[PDB]
XYZ file of C-alpha atoms in Angstrom:
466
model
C 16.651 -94.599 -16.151
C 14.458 -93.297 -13.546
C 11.281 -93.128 -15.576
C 9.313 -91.131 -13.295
C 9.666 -88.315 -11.020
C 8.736 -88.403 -7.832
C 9.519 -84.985 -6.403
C 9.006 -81.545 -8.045
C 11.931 -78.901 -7.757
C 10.663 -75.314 -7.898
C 12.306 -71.983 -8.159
C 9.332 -69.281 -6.848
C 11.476 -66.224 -7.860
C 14.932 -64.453 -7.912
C 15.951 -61.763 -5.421
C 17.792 -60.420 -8.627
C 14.911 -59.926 -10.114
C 13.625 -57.997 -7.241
C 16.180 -55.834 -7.595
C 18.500 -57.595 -4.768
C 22.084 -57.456 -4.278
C 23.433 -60.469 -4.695
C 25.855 -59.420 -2.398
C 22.666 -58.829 -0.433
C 21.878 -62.166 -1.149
C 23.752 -63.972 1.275
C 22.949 -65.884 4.502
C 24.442 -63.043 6.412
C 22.724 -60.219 4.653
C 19.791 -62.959 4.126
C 17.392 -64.258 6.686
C 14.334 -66.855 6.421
C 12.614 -68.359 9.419
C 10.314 -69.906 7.979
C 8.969 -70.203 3.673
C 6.245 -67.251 4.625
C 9.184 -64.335 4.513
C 12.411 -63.226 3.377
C 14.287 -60.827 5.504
C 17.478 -59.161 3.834
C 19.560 -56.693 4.477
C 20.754 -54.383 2.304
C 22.727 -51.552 2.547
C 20.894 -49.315 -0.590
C 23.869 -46.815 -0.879
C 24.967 -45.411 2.562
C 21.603 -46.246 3.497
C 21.545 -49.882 5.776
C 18.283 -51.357 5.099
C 16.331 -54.701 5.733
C 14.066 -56.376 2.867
C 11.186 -58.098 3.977
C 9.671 -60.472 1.403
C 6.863 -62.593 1.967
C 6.473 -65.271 -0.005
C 3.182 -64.956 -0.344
C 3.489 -61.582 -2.344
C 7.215 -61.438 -3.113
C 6.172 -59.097 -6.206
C 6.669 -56.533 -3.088
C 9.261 -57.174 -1.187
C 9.232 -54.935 1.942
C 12.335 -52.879 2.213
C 12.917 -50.946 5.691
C 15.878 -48.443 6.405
C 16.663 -50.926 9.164
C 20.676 -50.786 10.647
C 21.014 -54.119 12.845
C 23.154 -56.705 13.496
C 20.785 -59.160 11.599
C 16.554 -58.998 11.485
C 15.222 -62.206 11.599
C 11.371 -62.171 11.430
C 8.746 -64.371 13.501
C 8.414 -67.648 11.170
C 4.557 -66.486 10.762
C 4.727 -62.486 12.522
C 5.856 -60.050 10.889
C 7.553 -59.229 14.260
C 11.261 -59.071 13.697
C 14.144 -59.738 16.184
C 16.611 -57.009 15.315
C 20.017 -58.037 16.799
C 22.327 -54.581 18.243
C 25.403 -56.358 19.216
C 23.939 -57.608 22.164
C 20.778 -55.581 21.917
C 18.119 -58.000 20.339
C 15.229 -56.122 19.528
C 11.986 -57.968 18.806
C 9.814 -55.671 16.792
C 7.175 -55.918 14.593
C 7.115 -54.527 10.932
C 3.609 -55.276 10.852
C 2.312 -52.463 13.117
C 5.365 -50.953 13.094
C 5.712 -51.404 16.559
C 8.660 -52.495 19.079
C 7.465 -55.694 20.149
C 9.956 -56.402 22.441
C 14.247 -55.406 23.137
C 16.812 -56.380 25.284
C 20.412 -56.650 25.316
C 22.321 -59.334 26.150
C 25.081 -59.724 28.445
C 27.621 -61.354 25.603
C 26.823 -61.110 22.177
C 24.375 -63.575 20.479
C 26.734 -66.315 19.167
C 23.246 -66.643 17.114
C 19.609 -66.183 17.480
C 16.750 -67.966 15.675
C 13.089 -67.858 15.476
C 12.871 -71.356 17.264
C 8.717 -70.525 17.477
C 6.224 -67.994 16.408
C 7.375 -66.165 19.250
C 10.494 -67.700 20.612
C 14.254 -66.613 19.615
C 16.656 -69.223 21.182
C 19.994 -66.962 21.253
C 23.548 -68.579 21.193
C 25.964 -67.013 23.139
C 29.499 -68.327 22.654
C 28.839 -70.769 26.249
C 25.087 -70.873 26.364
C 21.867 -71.166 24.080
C 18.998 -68.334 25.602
C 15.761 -68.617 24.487
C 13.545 -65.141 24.432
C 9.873 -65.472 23.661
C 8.201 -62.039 22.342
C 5.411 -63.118 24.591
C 5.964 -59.836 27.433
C 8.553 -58.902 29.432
C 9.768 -62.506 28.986
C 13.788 -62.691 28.422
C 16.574 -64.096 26.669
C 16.176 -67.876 28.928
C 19.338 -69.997 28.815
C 17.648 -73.038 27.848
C 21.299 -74.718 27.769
C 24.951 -74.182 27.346
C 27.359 -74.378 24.484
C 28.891 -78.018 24.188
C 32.969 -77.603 24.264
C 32.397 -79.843 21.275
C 31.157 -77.181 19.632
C 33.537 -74.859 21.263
C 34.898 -72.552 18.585
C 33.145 -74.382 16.136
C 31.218 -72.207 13.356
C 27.864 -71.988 15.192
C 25.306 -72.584 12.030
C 22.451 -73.646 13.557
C 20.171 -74.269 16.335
C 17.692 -77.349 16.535
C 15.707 -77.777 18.725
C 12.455 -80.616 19.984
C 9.309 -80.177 18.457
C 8.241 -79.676 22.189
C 11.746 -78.174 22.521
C 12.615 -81.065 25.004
C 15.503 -82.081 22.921
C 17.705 -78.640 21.973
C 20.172 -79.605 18.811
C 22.899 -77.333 17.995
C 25.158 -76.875 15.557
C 29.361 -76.290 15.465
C 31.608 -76.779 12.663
C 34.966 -76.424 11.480
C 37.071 -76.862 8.929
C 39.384 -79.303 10.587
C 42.132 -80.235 8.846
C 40.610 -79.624 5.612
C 37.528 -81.198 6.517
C 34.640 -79.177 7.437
C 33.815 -81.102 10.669
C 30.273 -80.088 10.987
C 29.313 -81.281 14.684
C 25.866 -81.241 16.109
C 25.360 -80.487 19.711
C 21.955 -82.045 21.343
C 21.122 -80.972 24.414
C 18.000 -82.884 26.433
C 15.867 -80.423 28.823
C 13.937 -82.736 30.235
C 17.251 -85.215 31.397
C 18.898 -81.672 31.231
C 21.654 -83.159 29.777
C 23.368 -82.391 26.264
C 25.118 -84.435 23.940
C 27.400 -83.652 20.863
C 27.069 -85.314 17.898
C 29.166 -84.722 14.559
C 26.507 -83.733 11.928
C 26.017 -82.056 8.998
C 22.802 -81.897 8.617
C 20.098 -83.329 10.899
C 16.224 -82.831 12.142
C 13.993 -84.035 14.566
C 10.612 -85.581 12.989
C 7.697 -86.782 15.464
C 6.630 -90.308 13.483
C 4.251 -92.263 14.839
C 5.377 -96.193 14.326
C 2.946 -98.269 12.368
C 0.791 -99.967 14.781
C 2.260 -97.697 17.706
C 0.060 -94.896 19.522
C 1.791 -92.448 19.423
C 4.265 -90.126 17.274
C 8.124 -90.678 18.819
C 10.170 -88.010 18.326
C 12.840 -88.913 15.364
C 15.720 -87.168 15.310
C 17.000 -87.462 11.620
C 20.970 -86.112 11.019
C 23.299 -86.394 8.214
C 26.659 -85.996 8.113
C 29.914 -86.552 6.139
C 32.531 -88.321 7.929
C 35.629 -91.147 7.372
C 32.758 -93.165 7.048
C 31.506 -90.997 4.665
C 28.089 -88.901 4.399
C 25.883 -90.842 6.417
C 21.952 -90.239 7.786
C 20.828 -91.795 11.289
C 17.041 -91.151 12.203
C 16.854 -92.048 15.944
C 13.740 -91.332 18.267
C 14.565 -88.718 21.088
C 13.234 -90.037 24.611
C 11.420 -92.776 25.739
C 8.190 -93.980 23.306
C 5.191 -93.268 24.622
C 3.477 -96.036 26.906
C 2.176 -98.724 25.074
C 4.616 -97.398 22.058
C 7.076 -100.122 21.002
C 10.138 -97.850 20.411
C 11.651 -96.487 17.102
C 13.875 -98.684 15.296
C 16.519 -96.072 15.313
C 18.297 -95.861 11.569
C 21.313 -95.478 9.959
C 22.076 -94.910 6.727
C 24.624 -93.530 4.091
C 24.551 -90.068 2.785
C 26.680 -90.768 -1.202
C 28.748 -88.288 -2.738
C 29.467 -88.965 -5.774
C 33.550 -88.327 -7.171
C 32.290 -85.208 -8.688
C 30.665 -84.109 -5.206
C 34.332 -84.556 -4.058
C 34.368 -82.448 -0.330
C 30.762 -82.178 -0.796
C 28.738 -82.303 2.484
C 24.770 -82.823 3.783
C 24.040 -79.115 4.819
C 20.162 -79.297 4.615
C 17.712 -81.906 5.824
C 14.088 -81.831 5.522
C 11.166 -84.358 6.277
C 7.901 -84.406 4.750
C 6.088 -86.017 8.195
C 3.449 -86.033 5.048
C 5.341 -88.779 3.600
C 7.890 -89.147 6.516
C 10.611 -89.373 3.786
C 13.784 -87.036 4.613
C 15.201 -84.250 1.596
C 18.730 -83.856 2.276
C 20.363 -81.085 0.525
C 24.293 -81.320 0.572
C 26.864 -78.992 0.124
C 27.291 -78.787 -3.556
C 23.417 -78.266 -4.137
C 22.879 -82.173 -3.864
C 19.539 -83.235 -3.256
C 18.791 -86.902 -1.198
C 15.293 -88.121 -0.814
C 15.449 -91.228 2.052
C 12.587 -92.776 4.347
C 12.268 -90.919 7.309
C 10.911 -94.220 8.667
C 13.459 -96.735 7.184
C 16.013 -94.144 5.979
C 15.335 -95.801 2.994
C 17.531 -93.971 0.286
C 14.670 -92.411 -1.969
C 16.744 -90.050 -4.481
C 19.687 -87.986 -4.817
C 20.958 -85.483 -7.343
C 22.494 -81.949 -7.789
C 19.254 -79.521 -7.828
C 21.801 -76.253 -7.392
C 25.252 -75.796 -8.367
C 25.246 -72.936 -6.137
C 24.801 -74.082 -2.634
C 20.831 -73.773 -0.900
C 22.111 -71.533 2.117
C 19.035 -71.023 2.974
C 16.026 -73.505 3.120
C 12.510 -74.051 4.772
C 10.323 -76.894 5.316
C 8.124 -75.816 1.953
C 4.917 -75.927 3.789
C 2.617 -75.980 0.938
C 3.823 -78.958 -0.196
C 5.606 -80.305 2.860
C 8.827 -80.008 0.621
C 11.598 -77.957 1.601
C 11.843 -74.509 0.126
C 14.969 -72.263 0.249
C 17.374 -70.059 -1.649
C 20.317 -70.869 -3.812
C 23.553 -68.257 -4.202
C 21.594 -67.211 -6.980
C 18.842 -65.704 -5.172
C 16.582 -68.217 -5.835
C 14.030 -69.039 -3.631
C 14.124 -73.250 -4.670
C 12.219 -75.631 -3.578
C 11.874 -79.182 -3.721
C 9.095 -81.587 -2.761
C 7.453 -85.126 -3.483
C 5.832 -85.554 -6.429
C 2.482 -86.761 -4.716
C 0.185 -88.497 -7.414
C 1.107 -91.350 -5.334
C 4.178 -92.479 -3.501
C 2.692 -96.689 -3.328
C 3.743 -96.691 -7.261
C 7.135 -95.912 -7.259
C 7.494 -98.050 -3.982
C 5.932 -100.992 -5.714
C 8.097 -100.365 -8.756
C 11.415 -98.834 -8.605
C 11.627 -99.691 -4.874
C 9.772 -102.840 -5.828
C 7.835 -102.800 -2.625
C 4.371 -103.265 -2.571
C 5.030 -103.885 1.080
C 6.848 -100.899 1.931
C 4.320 -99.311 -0.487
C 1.494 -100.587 2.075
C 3.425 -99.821 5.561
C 4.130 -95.988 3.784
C 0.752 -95.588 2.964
C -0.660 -96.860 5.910
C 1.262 -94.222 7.936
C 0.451 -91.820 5.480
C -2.763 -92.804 5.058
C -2.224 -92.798 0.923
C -4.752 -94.532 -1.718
C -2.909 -97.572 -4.561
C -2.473 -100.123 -1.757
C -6.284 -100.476 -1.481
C -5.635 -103.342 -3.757
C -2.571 -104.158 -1.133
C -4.676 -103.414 1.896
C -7.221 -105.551 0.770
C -4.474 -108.262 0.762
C -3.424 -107.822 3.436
C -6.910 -108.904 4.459
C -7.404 -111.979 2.433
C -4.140 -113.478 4.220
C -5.153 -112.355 7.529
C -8.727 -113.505 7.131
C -6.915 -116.346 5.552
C -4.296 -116.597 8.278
C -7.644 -117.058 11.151
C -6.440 -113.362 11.951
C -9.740 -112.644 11.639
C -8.768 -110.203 15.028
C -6.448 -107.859 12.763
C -8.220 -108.418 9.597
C -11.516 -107.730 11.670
C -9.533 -104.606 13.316
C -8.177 -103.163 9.907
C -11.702 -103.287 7.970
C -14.244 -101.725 10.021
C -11.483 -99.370 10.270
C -9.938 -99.185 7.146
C -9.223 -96.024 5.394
C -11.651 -94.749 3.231
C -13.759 -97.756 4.271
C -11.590 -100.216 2.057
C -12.490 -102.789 3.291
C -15.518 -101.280 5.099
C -17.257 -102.191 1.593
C -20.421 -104.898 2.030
C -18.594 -107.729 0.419
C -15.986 -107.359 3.393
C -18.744 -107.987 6.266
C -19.942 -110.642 3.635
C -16.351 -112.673 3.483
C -16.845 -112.179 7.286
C -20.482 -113.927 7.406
C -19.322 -116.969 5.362
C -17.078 -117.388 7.812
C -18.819 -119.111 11.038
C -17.816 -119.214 14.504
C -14.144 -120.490 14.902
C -12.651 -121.520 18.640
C -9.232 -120.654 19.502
C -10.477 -116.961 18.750
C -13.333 -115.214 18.909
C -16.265 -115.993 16.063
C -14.114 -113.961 13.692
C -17.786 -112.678 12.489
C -18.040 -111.498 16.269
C -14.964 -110.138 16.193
C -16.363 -107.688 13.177
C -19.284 -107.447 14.933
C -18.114 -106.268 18.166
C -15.771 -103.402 16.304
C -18.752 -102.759 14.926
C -20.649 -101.891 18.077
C -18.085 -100.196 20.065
C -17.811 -97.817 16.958
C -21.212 -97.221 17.996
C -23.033 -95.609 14.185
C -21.447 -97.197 11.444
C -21.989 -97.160 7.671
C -24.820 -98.447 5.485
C -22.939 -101.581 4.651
C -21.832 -101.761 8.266
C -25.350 -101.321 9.912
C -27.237 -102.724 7.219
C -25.449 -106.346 7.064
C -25.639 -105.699 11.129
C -29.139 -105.210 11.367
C -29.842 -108.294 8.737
C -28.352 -111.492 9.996
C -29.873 -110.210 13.667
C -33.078 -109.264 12.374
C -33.361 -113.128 11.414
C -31.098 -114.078 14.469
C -34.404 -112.704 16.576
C -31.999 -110.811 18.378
C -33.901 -107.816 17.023
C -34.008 -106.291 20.369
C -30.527 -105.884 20.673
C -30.743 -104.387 17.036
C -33.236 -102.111 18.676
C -30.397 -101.039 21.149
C -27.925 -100.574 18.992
C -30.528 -98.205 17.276
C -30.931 -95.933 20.666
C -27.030 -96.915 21.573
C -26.674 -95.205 18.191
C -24.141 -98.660 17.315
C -25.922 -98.291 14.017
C -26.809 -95.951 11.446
C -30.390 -95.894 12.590
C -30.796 -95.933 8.881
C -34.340 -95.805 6.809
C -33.048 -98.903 5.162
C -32.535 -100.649 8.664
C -36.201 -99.341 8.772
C -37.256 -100.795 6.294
C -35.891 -104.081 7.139
């Protein structure tokens, strides 16, 4: 009895209702690169045309005599690339204007807005990735896996710094739609097939690491069943201890009998994965510790179509039924369905604290008592002058901090605060003021005074008026 929601599914409109074949309403004759359009084609009569709606006003949707292979339209631009058999032509609706053509050699396998600007192409050997920057062309980034050889080219992933290029064959093997992901590596320029139904590469930064490492999420029905690995993708970052890479099972239930993941989102907001399966099947899990969040039918027609939803760091798309869906956490707060459903006040804390989320202020502050507790007066020290929203920035903090006196073994745990302190040079009131007071009466009112032009205090008027 799952009391509480913690996502919100939304439909924003029906193509129907625009007046949209729902022929026309089909990931051929459909096309979204990204939740700010939707490109469709649609042949009105003997007349071949291309709708353009923008989410953002989809009350006019832009329809445009336009005869191509398929339009798909820069994720933000309203520059389109307009596919002529091998004749990709990168214009833009906006102005009007021919951004950018050229034909290709062999036929794009399949072409994707990859960037604002970028279409990697998939020819049936090769991916070729064509900026609209200038006379830039169609680039072979990589080459088709034989893996994927054949296999129904969906999809095209690629690194969020397009170091790691992910694509996408499948085929229904012996009655099994073996949906296979190909990742190729530019930088070790070396590719890699993986069987997947649905995957995505997420830059997380670890708790307590320094940097984001690039996760690579991917679902995917197998013997094994439908199962979800989030891995990082090249070495962590100096000084980064390395993603834990995951693993975890994607369920079907009896009734989603041959069902399969065939969208996965991440809201890096949250870092929890959406993954939308074949038979509209919604799964919420951890994009951290692929924690299984949720999972349910959202569509009984299938979500061809999704996008990240952006506004809400969701993922948006569109169901059979024209319906531009989308799905996304119900953000009140995350911590209390950790703490309560998920029972983890801990895994409430480590979310937050990656996310940076308020309801484990009571938990951070915890935290503090046992590491203050603990002697880690280092951490604790570490975590309060820099908690978020101040926390445990509050007076009574650096007060905890002055009962406690100077302790070998470690640094004076109040020096430890203290020294944060400075090298965060200004500070708060609390912070400078119960800075300034102890010294004042320690005599060491000079080095107050340098704080004061060192600016490692507030130079407040209450410091002047102590």
């Amino acid at each position: 009895m799952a009391q509480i929601l913690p996502i919100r599914f939304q439909e924003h409109l029906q193509l129907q209702n625009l007046g949209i074949n729902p022929a026309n309403i089909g990931f051929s004759t459909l096309t979204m690169e990204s939740d700010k359009f939707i490109c469709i084609r649609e042949k009105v009569g003997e007349q071949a045309q291309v709708v353009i709606i923008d989410m953002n006003d989809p009350s006019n949707p832009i329809r445009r005599p336009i005869s191509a292979d398929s339009a798909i339209m820069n994720p933000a631009s309203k520059v389109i690339a307009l596919k002529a058999g091998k004749t990709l032509q990168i214009f833009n609706i906006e102005m009007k204007s021919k951004m950018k053509a050229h034909t290709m050699t062999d036929d794009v396998t399949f072409w994707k807005w990859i960037s604002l600007n970028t279409v990697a192409l998939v020819t049936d050997n090769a991916v070729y990735h064509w900026s609209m920057e200038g006379e830039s062309q169609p680039v072979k980034m990589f080459d088709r896996h034989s893996s994927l050889a054949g296999c129904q080219i969906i999809n095209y992933r690629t690194d969020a710094k397009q170091k790691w290029l992910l694509l996408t064959g499948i085929s229904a093997q012996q009655n099994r739609v073996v949906g296979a992901m190909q990742l190729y590596s530019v930088d070790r320029k070396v590719s890699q097939p993986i069987e997947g139904h649905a995957a995505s590469f997420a830059q997380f930064k670890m708790e307590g690491n320094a940097e984001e490492s690039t996760l690579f999420c991917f679902a995917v029905r197998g013997q094994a069943g439908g199962k979800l690995h989030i891995i990082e993708v090249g070495t962590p970052p100096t000084g980064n201890q390395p993603f834990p890479k995951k693993a975890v099972d994607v369920f079907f239930p009896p009734e989603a009998q041959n069902d399969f993941p065939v969208a996965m989102q991440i809201s890096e907001k949250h870092d929890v994965v959406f993954l939308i399966t074949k038979y509209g099947y919604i799964h919420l899990y951890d994009l951290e510790t692929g924690t299984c969040i949720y999972m349910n039918r959202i569509s009984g027609e299938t979500i061809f179509v999704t996008a990240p939803h952006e506004a809400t760091a969701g993922i948006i798309g569109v169901n059979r039924k024209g319906q531009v869906l989308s799905v996304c956490v119900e953000e009140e707060n995350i911590i209390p369905y950790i703490t309560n459903v998920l029972q983890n006040p801990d895994l409430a804390l480590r979310m937050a604290v990656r996310n940076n989320l308020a309801g484990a202020e009571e938990l951070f502050a915890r935290k503090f008592n046992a590491l203050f507790a603990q002697g880690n007066y280092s951490e604790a020290a570490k975590v309060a002058a820099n908690a978020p929203k101040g926390i445990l920035r509050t007076p009574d903090t650096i007060r905890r901090f002055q009962s406690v006196p100077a302790q070998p073994g470690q640094t004076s745990p109040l020096l430890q605060y203290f020294g944060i302190l400075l090298d965060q040079g200004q500070l708060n009131k609390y912070e400078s003021l119960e800075l300034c007071r102890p010294v004042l009466q320690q005599g060491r009112k000079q080095l107050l005074e340098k704080w004061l032009k060192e600016d490692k205090l507030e130079c407040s008027e209450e410091l002047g008026d102590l």
